[PDB]
Amino acid sequence: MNFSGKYQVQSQENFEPFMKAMGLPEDLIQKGKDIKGVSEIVHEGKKVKLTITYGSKVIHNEFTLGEECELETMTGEKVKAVVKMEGDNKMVTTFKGIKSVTEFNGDTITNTMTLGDIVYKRVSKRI
Ligand SMILES: CCCCCCCC/C=C\CCCCCCCC(=O)O
Numbered sequence: 001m002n003f004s005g006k007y008q009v010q011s012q013e014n015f016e017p018f019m020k021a022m023g024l025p026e027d028l029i030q031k032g033k034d035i036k037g038v039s040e041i042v043h044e045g046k047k048v049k050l051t052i053t054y055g056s057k058v059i060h061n062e063f064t065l066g067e068e069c070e071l072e073t074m075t076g077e078k079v080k081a082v083v084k085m086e087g088d089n090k091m092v093t094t095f096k097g098i099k100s101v102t103e104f105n106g107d108t109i110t111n112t113m114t115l116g117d118i119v120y121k122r123v124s125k126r127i
């Protein structure tokens with residue numbers, strides 16, 4: 001399907017509770033709470049190059065679909081995980097008890113991460 005492009009967050013639910021349970025330090029939660037971050041994807045085959053920019057904070061991640069790689073979380077911690085291609089438009093992965101589902105529909109990306117009873121929801125559109 002090719003997911004290349006630049007997108008910006010339009011809306012989100014449960015950012016604070018989810019981020020809290022992730023151990024993201026208070027002040028950052030307060031700061032990123034109101035930042036409409038930009039995400040850039042470069043998709044080439046099973047190679048996904050991902051860059052997330054939140055104001056002055058940037059995180060670079062790169063992984064191969066199906067392969068176990070090391071993902072950098074927003075705290076700085078690094079984890080190992082396999083990102084899978086579920087269906088034709090969904091990228092699914094699991095780490096630290098979190099279940100992550102990214103669904104692509106043209107200009108719209110919908111991301112859903114569930115931790116316990118919390119469901120952090122993000123809706124982005126291509127810019
Ligand atoms: C697509 C998977 C979901 C990615 C969620 C990313 C969430 C990032 C969380 C917030 C980071 C907080 C950074 C606060 C601002 C730091 C620098 C600044 O002030 O500009």
Ligand SMILES: CCCCCCCC/C=C\CCCCCCCC(=O)O
Nearest residue numbers: 039072073074091102109111122124
């Ligand atoms: C807890 C947040 C830590 C974020 C680390 C990155 C994890 C990303 C894992 C899944 C890859 C799916 C890529 C989807 C990009 C969506 C961009 C967006 O929603 O802004």
